[PDB]
């Protein structure tokens, strides 16, 4: 008979909702926008247990912001109180160092697509 | 029958491992035995995975030690090459610019058994 639909279309991750060429056409029409501003996707581990899920994941950030400054704007977002852990990890699961200006991360870590790909979780994974 | 004997050499976490009465015993003598010493316990925290573990996680820090002090010993120990991130963490918060003494960390944040906990984290962790 029907399918029992597990999921929704807005439950899957961004690569997933957007073509690969139209993920590209948008970093480069962002890019000429916005020339000074790195194109950021942040989404919540799969896995995760006890972080909130933040509602808006694209961001666009200052090539000087450093990833201690972003840390601090994701939790803000997400209301969090300070007590509660949190890491922002780039890429594949990388620690990348908290001062290096997020443009530098953006050349070694951006996906192909060209957004610079992270996730957020309760701990390092993995 | 024949019961398999189970070891838990374990040292770490540290609060976990040992019982409360033998922890604040253990305080106890090591102030009797240098009162100019905070004793320390600095661990890895559990959702910290690309930092190394260190060999040893028990210090006794001169009083007048402030944390850029005691981040620049840790980071040595962990060889750590001078732009990897690294943070001390105490009772889940941030000690990202605390510049007082440890003696007086020591009094605002000691546990109940006497020593006090760090751990560290390649972020911040914590707002504080």
Redesign the interface.
């Known amino acids: 008979d029907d399918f029992v639909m597990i999921g929704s279309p807005s439950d899957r991750p961004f690569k997933q909702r957007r073509s690969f060429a139209d993920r590209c056409k948008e970093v480069q029409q962002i890019r000429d926008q916005h020339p000074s501003k790195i194109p950021v996707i942040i989404e919540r581990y799969k896995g995760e247990k006890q972080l909130p899920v933040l509602d808006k994941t694209k961001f666009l950030v200052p090539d000087h912001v450093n ?2 400054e972003l ?2 704007i994701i ?1 803000r977002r997400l209301q ?9 990890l780039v890429n594949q699961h990388s ?6 200006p997020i443009a530098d991360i953006y050349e070694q870590e951006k996906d192909e697509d060209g957004f610079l790909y992270m996730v957020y979780a ?5």
């Not at 969090?80 to 922002?88: C, G, Y």
């Not at 620690?95 to 290096?100: F, K």
């Open positions: 990833m201690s840390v601090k939790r969090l109180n300070p007590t509660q852990a949190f890491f922002l620690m990348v160092s908290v001062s290096t309760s701990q390092e994974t993995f």
